[PDB]
C-alpha cells in the first residue's frame, strides 16, 4: 500500500498507470474480438477471445466490437475481460495490493455505476476505490480552479461550468456526438468519392486516416470554393495493400459536423452553441471568469485550427466588448489521467476512498451520495 | 432442457403405454406406482379396488389447506370435467379415468392431466388476477408457503399486481453461487422490451412482508416481479404462470449447469498445463 492505480475507461481507448507518474504505462484501444472463421489447423487451440493490441494486429479475421458505446457499457463480459487483461497481463499488479480509481462521463445512469462498483468490490476485491468525473480531473491537470471544460471524447462530448471552490450541476450539457459519428460520416463520404469501407478493419483504417489527414476550416464556403480549384489541397494516403487514396474536401468536411450536426440529421446544436447556452445559464458575474478561461480536453479536439474557429465563433456570438481566450495545451489527450493521478496523490483524498467494510454494511447506493 | 418443462412425462408415457393397447379386449393391466416431482409433492397412481377398469391419480400438496379454504370451484369444471371425485389419499385432489366409457381424445386429455400441479396452483393466482380485473374490492393479500421452508406472498391491488419471492439455500457451497446468480437477475434487461421490473434485496426485507409472517431471517434474499395487464391478460397469463412456478427449479438446474460448465473449462485448462509441463522431458 504505497500508491494507487488510475484507470480511465475511455469510450474508444483505455488509459492506465501508477499514481505519481507523468505518463501512462498502458495505452491500448478497447477492442474485444472473437474469431469469425471456423479454423482448420490442429497445432493451435489459441485464445477463443482476443483483446488489446493483439486484436488490432490480427483484426482481419475477427469481428471487432467496442464494449462501450457512447459512454454507456453494453456488454459487461467484455468490460470485465478488458479489466482483467489490463490488470494482469499489462500492469502485472494484483488488485489487492493497491486501490483503483475510475472515471465516467456526467449524466450517466446509476445502474452502470452500481454494477461497476459491485463487480470491482466482489470480483477483484479491491481494498478501496472511487468514482470521479473526467472534467474535474482535467481542471486538476490544468492547475486551475475556474473555467469551462470541453471534454469531447470518442463517445461523448460534455461541458461542466465551474467556479472557485464549487460547481454548477444545473448547467451541464451532454452531447452524444463524438468521434464514432465522425468516422461513420467519413465512411459515408468516402463512399461518395469512390472508395468503399464497411467492415470494422476498414473502420480502424478510416479512423487512422482521419487521425492523420483531417483538419478544421476557418470558413466553410471559402474552403469549398478553393476546393473548386482543386490543385493544392488534395493529399494521398498509402493503404496497407499499397493502394493510394486521394482525399480532398473530405479533410475539412467531416470535422465541420461538430459545428453543423444537421449533416448527420441530429436536431441539436454545435459545440459553440451548447457552450454559449451553458455559460448563459450561469450567473452574470461568473460569466466573465468563464469567458476568460476555457479548458478543452479529449481526443476529438486535436484538429489544428479548432481553437481558432471556436474563438472566432464565440467572439462573434458573445458581445464584442471583452476578451475571449482559448487555452489549448499540447497534452490534452492524457489530461484526465494526469488529473486523476494528481488527485490520488493529494493527502486530503486518502480518506475519501470507499472501503469494503463500509460498502458491505451500507450497500451499492453509497457511491451515489459520494460526490454525486 | 433450458426452460424446465411443466408436463411430467412420466404420466404421459405410462398413459400412452396403457392406451396404445386399450383397444385389445378385457385388458386390465393392474397398475400401482408412486412418483415424486418438484416442490416436494408425492404422486400416486393406483386402482381404487380390485376393479381394474378404473385408474386413479392423486396428489399430496403441502399447502393443500390454503387451496381448500380458497375454493377452486372454477378448476372443478373448466379444465377437469366429470372425471374428478372427492379426495381419498390424504384429503388432496384426486382424479380417475373411466375406461368403460369411450375415451375419444387421446393427446388433449393426457396433456391436461400432465400439468396437474400447475393446474391446481393457478387456482389462486388466476383468481387474484380476476379480482383485480373484475373491479371487485382488492381481495385480501395471501401468503402461500409450499413444501420448501421459503415463502411466497402476493398482493393484488388496483392498477397492478405484485409478487415477491423468498429464497433459501441449504448447502453452504451453493449459497454464494446462488447469490451471484440472482445478483445479475435484477439488472439483465437489455434483451427484453415488454418485461416486468426485477429487483433483489436480502438485507432489508420489503415493507410489505413486515406484518406478514413470511420467510424472515438473515441468509434469505428477496425477489419481486411487478405485474401489469400488458403481460397478465388472458393471452399471456399461462406463460407467466408457468415461468413463475418453474422459477425455483429453473434456478437450481441452471446452477448445476454452470457447475458443469466450469468443470469442463478447468478440464480443458489442465491440458494446457500438461502441455506447458511437457517442456521438461527430453527429445
Amino acid at each position: 500500500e504505497t500508491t494507487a492505480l488510475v484507470c480511465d475507461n475511455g469510450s474508444g481507448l483505455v488509459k492506465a498507470g501508477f499514481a505519481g507518474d507523468d505518463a501512462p504505462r498502458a495505452v491500448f484501444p478497447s477492442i474485444v474480438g472473437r474469431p469469425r472463421h471456423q479454423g482448420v489447423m490442429v497445432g493451435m487451440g489459441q485464445k477463443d477471445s482476443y483483446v488489446g493490441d493483439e486484436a488490432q494486429s490480427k483484426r482481419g479475421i475477427l469481428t471487432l466490437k467496442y464494449p462501450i458505446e457512447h459512454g454507456i457499457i453494453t456488454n459487461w463480459d467484455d468490460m470485465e475481460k478488458i479489466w482483467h487483461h489490463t490488470f494482469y497481463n499489462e500492469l502485472r499488479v494484483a488488485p489487492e495490493e493497491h486501490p483503483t480509481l475510475l472515471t465516467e462521463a456526467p449524466l450517466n445512469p446509476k445502474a452502470n455505476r452500481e454494477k461497476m462498483t459491485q463487480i470491482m468490490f466482489e470480483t477483484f476485491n479491491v481494498p478501496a476505490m472511487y468514482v470521479a468525473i473526467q472534467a474535474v480531473l482535467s481542471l486538476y491537470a490544468s492547475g486551475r480552479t475556474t473555467g469551462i471544460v470541453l471534454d469531447s471524447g470518442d463517445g461523448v462530448t460534455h461541458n461542466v461550468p465551474i467556479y472557485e471552490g464549487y460547481a454548477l450541476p444545473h448547467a451541464i450539457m451532454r452531447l452524444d456526438l463524438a468521434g464514432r459519428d465522425l468516422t461513420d460520416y467519413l465512411m459515408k463520404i468516402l463512399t461518395e468519392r469512390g472508395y468503399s469501407f464497411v467492415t470494422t478493419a476498414e473502420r480502424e483504417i478510416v479512423r487512422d486516416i482521419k487521425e492523420k489527414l483531417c483538419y478544421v476550416a476557418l470558413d466553410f464556403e471559402n474552403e469549398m470554393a478553393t476546393a473548386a480549384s482543386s490543385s493544392s489541397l488534395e493529399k494521398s494516403y498509402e493503404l496497407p495493400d499499397g493502394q493510394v487514396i486521394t482525399i480532398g474536401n473530405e479533410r475539412f468536411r467531416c470535422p465541420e459536423t461538430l459545428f453543423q450536426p444537421s449533416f448527420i440529421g441530429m436536431e441539436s446544436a454545435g459545440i459553440h452553441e451548447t457552450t454559449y447556452n451553458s455559460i448563459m445559464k450561469c450567473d452574470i458575474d461568473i460569466r466573465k471568469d468563464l469567458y476568460a478561461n476555457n479548458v478543452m480536453s479529449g481526443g476529438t479536439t486535436m484538429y489544428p485550427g479548432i481553437a481558432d474557429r471556436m474563438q472566432k465563433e464565440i467572439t462573434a456570438l458573445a458581445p464584442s466588448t471583452m476578451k475571449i481566450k482559448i487555452i489549448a495545451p499540447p497534452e490534452r489527450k492524457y489530461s484526465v489521467w494526469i488529473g486523476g493521478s494528481i488527485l490520488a496523490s493529494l493527502s486530503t483524498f486518502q480518506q475519501m476512498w470507499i472501503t469494503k467494510q463500509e460498502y458491505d454494511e451500507a450497500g451499492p447506493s453509497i457511491v451515489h451520495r459520494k460526490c454525486f | 432442457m433450458i426452460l424446465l418443462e411443466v408436463n411430467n412425462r412420466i404420466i404421459e408415457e405410462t398413459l400412452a403405454l396403457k392406451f396404445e393397447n386399450a383397444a385389445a379386449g378385457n385388458k386390465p393391466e393392474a397398475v400401482e406406482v408412486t412418483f415424486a416431482d418438484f416442490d416436494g409433492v408425492l404422486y400416486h397412481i393406483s386402482n381404487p379396488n380390485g376393479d381394474k377398469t378404473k385408474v386413479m391419480v392423486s396428489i399430496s400438496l403441502k399447502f393443500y389447506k390454503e387451496l381448500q379454504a380458497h375454493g377452486a370451484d372454477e378448476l372443478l369444471k373448466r379444465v377437469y370435467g366429470s372425471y374428478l371425485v372427492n379426495p381419498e389419499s390424504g384429503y388432496n385432489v384426486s382424479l380417475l379415468y373411466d375406461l368403460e366409457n369411450l375415451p375419444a381424445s387421446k393427446d388433449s386429455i393426457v396433456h391436461q392431466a400432465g400439468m396437474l400441479k400447475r393446474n391446481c396452483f393457478a387456482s389462486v393466482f388466476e383468481k387474484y388476477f380476476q379480482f383485480q380485473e373484475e373491479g371487485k374490492e382488492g381481495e385480501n393479500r395471501a401468503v402461500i408457503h409450499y413444501r420448501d421452508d421459503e415463502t411466497m406472498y402476493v398482493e393484488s391491488k388496483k392498477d397492478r399486481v405484485t409478487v415477491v419471492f423468498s429464497t433459501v439455500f441449504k448447502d453452504d457451497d451453493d449459497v454464494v453461487i446462488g447469490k451471484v446468480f440472482m445478483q445479475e437477475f435484477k439488472e439483465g434487461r437489455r434483451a427484453s422490451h415488454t418485461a416486468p421490473q426485477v429487483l433483489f434485496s436480502h438485507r432489508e426485507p420489503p415493507l410489505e412482508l413486515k406484518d406478514t409472517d413470511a420467510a424472515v431471517g438473515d441468509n434469505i434474499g428477496y425477489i419481486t416481479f411487478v405485474l401489469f395487464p400488458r403481460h397478465t391478460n388472458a393471452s399471456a397469463r399461462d406463460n407467466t404462470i408457468n415461468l413463475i412456478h418453474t422459477f425455483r427449479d429453473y434456478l437450481h438446474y441452471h446452477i448445476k449447469c454452470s457447475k458443469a460448465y466450469i468443470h469442463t473449462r478447468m478440464r480443458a485448462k489442465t491440458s494446457d498445463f500438461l502441455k506447458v509441463l511437457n517442456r521438461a522431458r527430453p527429445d
Binding site: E69, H70, I72 | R190
Partner: peptide, 7 residues
C-alpha cells in the same frame, strides 16, 4: 441507452 439512442 434503453430508450432513445441504442446504448
Amino acid at each position: 441507452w434503453x430508450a432513445x439512442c441504442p446504448a
